[model samples]
Target: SGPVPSRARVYTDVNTHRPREYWDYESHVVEWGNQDDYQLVRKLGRGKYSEVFEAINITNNEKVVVKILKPVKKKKIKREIKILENLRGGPNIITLADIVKDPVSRTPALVFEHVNNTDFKQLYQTLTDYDIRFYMYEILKALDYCHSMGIMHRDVKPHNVMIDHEHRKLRLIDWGLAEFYHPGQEYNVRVASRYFKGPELLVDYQMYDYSLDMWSLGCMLASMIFRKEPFFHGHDNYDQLVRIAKVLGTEDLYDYIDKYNIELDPRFNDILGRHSRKRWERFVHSENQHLVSPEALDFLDKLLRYDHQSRLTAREAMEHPYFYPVVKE
Candidate 1:
C-alpha cells in the first residue's frame, strides 16, 4: 500500500482523478500509419528513445518535430503514445500530431508540433534574469497541468524542455520518460537522468510521484542561476548520490531513509560520511549573483528536499513567491 495522505507524504486525493484506463499504458495497443508524408528537413538529434529530426509534410508543407525511435519494446512505444494522447490539450505540452513507422524494417516514428528551439547550452547563457523566472514559471504550467491530469514526467531537464525565445513559447517535450501516476505503486527509481534525479531516486527509494518533476525542475533552476552546467556532477550513478549528499547533508538522508524504513545500500557508506547541509548562499558569485534572490532561493529550497513528500507540489510551487509576477498579471 502507498503512504497515508493524512501525513501528506504522497498524493492525498488520487482516488478521484486517475482514470483506470489512463493509468494502464502497458495494455494500450499502438497502431502505426504511413510515414511517407514526411521528408526529413534536418537531423535534430538522436537519443536512447529516438533519432530526432525536423521534417516537413510533403502534402501540407508544414514542418514538424519527427521522433524516429530505435528498435525498442512494443509496450514502451505504446506507453509514450498513450500518455501523449491523454495530455492532448494542456498548456505548454508538446503536441502529438501523428504516428508512423517503416513497414519493412518496422522503425517507429512520431510527429509533434515544431518549435524553433535553441539548445539550452547557448540559450541559458543568453537569458536575462527575468527570462529564467518566466520560463521556470511556464514550465510549472505544463508540469502542474500534467500532474493534475495524473501524469509524472520522470525526466524533467533542460534537454527535455524546449523554448522558442522569439515567440516566447515553451513546450515540455519528450514523453519517453513520462508515466501515469498511481499512488502507492512502487515506481522504478531508475527513471530520470542522473544529475537531475531527486533524492528519493538517488537513495533507491521507489513509490515516488509528481514531486519527482519538481526536484528536476529545481536542478535546472540551480544550474541556470548558479551558472554551473550541472549543479551536482556525479561521475556515475553511485557518485550521483554522493554529489547530492554533499549538498543536502548526511543527517537529512538518514532522517528521510529512516522515516520510510529505506535501507540505503551498504556501499553507500563509502561516500556517506558526516557532512553538514551546504548553504544555498555559498553558490553565489559575482557573475551569477544578479539571478539569485531570496525568493528563488526559497523556491529552490522547497523543491530540492531530501524528503520527496516535503517538496512542494507543482500547484503549490506555482503559488510560491518566485512566481508572484505570473499571478499579479
Candidate 2:
C-alpha cells in the first residue's frame, strides 16, 4: 500500500502548541539592527534567494555570515526568520545573530556565526569512509533534533551542510526552505534543488513529511560513496525521475505510484517502462572503492526507497550497521 499522509511521529504537532505569532510572518515587526556592526570580509556564496558574505562582527571581533536576501515576498522573508528564531540553539541548527535592513536600499540581511567549512566538491573528495560515517551521523543528529522540534528542512543537500572538518563539526546551515509541519500539510513541491530532489517531489506529491529529508540525505550519501557529484544527474525535472528509476528500477517506481493512487503525468507514459534495480556495488570503481562497504550500500539502499515513508527515519538510520562504527564509540 502507498504510504499516505507521511507525518513524522515526533514533533508532529509542536507547531500546533506554538502561538500563531510565531508563524505569522506577514505581521512580524522586526527590530532592524545596524548593518555597521558587521563589516564584510568577502562574499561567501550566493543562492536564488540571497548573497552570503563572511564578515567580522565589529563589536566582538568574531567572524560571522551575512546573508543578504534578494528582493522577494515579505512573507517568505518572515517565514525564514520565524523558523530560525523557533529553532535557535537546537542541535546543529545554524545560528542567527542579527537581522538588519539597509537603511538606503531596504534590503534585509541576516547575520550568523561563521563556520570554517570546505566546499563540498573539494571536501568530499578527501573524506575516508570512516569520515563519511562520522559526518553522516553528525547530519542525522541535526535532522532528528529538527524533526523532534516539528520542523522539516525542505533543503538538505550537501551544500547546506557546513562541515568544520578540523573540529569534526557539522551544522545544518540554511533555513530559507525549512517550515514547521502541520499534519495533512500540503507543501510546495518546487522545494529542494534538482539533483537531490526526492521521488515524492519529482512526482508532485505535496503531503510529504520528515522522511523527505532522509531522501535528500540518501542522495548525499550516494554521491559520497559512489563518487558522483550527483548520483542521479537529471537534465531537468522529469529527467530526475527517469534518472532515479534508471537506478532504483522502473517497475518498483510504478508500484509506488499505483499504490498511492497517483495519476502519473502524461510525460511519464511512453518514456517510462520496466527496468531492474541496479546493484549498488555496480557503482564502485578504483577511485571510490575504498569507501564502498557492504554496510554503506545497505544503508544507502534503505534511505533511497521510492516510497518516502518506507525510508529510514533519522533515529532508525543512526542504528543501522553502516553507522555502528560511529555509534558504538
Candidate 3:
C-alpha cells in the first residue's frame, strides 16, 4: 500500500467555506501606503527576504517597525500581504499597520506595531518556570487562532516570537513563509528555521498540517527546560536530522519512516546507525531541574513525535498539565 497522507484534525474546511478570492493572492492588487508617513530610526535586523528597522510613524509620532522587503517575486509579496490582511486583528498576531512603497524606487515596505522586545537569548535565561508557561501559553493562542483560520505559520521559532516582558506581551511576527492549508496538499518541505524544523520537514514529508508548529513549539520548550540554545543542535541541514536521531534514536526514526513510506535521503545512508530512543529524563540537570517537571517532560515527548499526525495540536497543547495554574503548596 502507498503512504497515507494526514490532515488537520480541526478546522480542515475553513478555506473551503470562504470565497476563492480570500485565499487567492496572485489575483489580488496591491494597495500602497505613503512611505513619507514614516521615518526610519535605526536598523533592527536583516533576513534572507527583508531588512528590518525601527521607524517613527510621523503621523502619530509613535514608534513602529518598517520592514523593507528585498527584491523577490511579486507573487511572494502578494501572498504575505494577503495573509496579513486575512489575519488582521487576530489575538497575539503582529498587527500590520500599513504597507508603504518608495514612490521613485518602487521598493515596498511593511509597517508594523512596535514591540518592546528583549531578545530571546537574554530573556529565556531570565525566565522562571511560570514565566515560560505564561509566554508559551500565549504562543499557543496565536497558533490556535491562525490554525483555525486555515493558515500555517510554517516558521515558528524564538526569533519570530517577539516578547515585551515589561508589558507582559507576545506577538507572533513574520508572515513571509506562512501559507494556507488545504487538505492533502503537498507543500514544499523547504520551510521553517533549521533548529525548529519538525521531523516531517526533515524527512521530506510534504503532506503536513498545522501540527507542524506544535513540533517547533516542542523544540522551543525543550531548549528552555534543558538550557540548551537549540535542543537539536544540527551543524547543517543534513546534520540537523543526525542531531535529532542521536537523541531520538535511529531505530525509532526508521519505524516512523516505515509507517509513512518515506525514503531516507541518500546522504543519511552512511551516517545513520542503529540506536535506541533515549529517555527524556537524560536531559535534566541541576541547572535546568527547576524547569523540568514530570508534566513538562510528558508534554515535550508528545510534541516531538516522528509522525506529524501524532504530535499535539496547539489547542490540545494548551490543555496539558504543564499549563495548569500553579497551586500554593
Candidate 4:
C-alpha cells in the first residue's frame, strides 16, 4: 500500500494563477527557428534523451550550445521547451536561445548560451573554500527561482550544474526531468541519478517537491567537502538507502519512513542493519578539514535530513551562515 499523500511546504500555488496555455505543454505549439542560423562545432556529449554539441551562432558570431533531441514522445519534448521558456532569465537558470528543427529529417533541437565549464570531478578539486560558498549560493538562487514559479527540478546532479570559473558564472542546466508542482501531486520516483537521489525518492514516496533538489545539493556539497566523488556509494538502489543510513543512521531512517507511513521494500530486510547516526566530524580529516568548517557542517546537516519538509528551502539556505562571506555585500 502507498503512504499518505504530501504537499510542498512553500510556493504551492504558483501555477494556479497562470493561464492554461502557460502550463499546458501537451497542447502547446512549438515555434521552431531557422536551423541553419547555428552551425555545430563539435559534439559535447550525449545522454539517453539528447545529443549535445558545441555550436556557433552564425548571425551574431557568438558561441552557443545545441541539444539535438532524440526520438522521444512529442509531449516530453514540449515539456522541456515550455519549462525553459518559463524559466528564461531567472538567476543562474540556463537561457534557452532558440528552438529549431531540420526541414528534411524533422529532427528537433534547442539552442542555449554557451557556458565555459569543467566537469564537477575536476572542478571541485580546484575550488577554494570561498569559491564553493559563492557557487553554491548561486545555485540556491536558481533553485529558489524555479520553485517559486511552481517547478521542481527532479534531476539535480553535479553534471547538470554548469560553472564558468573564470567568469564566476553558474547556470542550472538540464530541465528534461523538471516538472510543474501542484500541491499534493505524486511525482515519478524514477527521476534523479542514483547517488544524488533523496530519501523521499529511494523510499518511493512520490509526493515530493523542491526539497528534492535541496537533498541533491547536500549530496553534492557533502562530496566536495569530504573529498568523496560520490558522498553515498551505493551498489544498487536498495543499497543506496543503506549507504545513507550508514551515515545518517538506521533509527532516523525508520522514523522518516514511519512519519510518511512508507513501506520499505521486502529486500531491505536482508541487508539493512541497525546503525546509529554517525557524526559529521567522522568525515573531517587533514585533507578535507579546510572545506568542512563548523558552518559548512551545520548547513549540510540541515539539508541532509530524512524528512523532506525538515530540509531548508533554497532561499532559507542562501541565508545560512555558511554563505555569509559570499552573500554579504
Tell me each candidate's TM-score. Answer: 0.94, 0.95, 0.96, 0.98
lDDT of 4 at 299: 98
Evaluated with lDDT, which candidate comes out highest? Answer: 4
Considering TM-score, which of the candidate structures 1 and 4 is the better prediction for this target? 4
Which lDDT tens digits does candidate 3 get at residues 1-329?
66667777888989999999989889999888899999999999999999999999888899999999999999999999999999899989999999999989899999999998999989999999999888889999999999998999999999999999999999999999999999989999999999999888987889989989998998999999889989999887788988998888898789899988887789989887877789988988899999999998988999998877888888888888888963211
Instruction: Quote the positional error of residue 154 for candidate 4 in Å.
Output: 1.2
lDDT of 4 by residue, 179-294 (tens): 99888788899998999999998888888999999999999999998899799999988899999999999998999988889988899987889999999999889998888899
Q: Tell me the deviation in Å of residue 231 in model 2.
A: 0.3
**Rank ordering of all candidates by lDDT, starting from the highest:** 4, 3, 2, 1
Candidate 4 minimal-lDDT segment of 10 residues: 1-10
lDDT of 3 at 286: 93
Task: Identify the candidate with maximal TM-score.
Answer: 4
Model 2 residue 252 distance off true place after TM-score fit, in angstroms: 1.5
How many clashes show up in model 2? 0
Estimate candidate 2's alpha-carbon lDDT, on a 0 to 1 scale.
0.88
- Which parts of model 4 have CA positions greater than 4 angstroms off? none
Residue-level lDDT for 314 in candidate 4:
93
Model 3 CA deviation exceeding 4 Å by range: 1-3, 326-329
Ranking by TM-score: 4, 3, 2, 1
User: Candidate 3 — which pairs collide?
Assistant: none
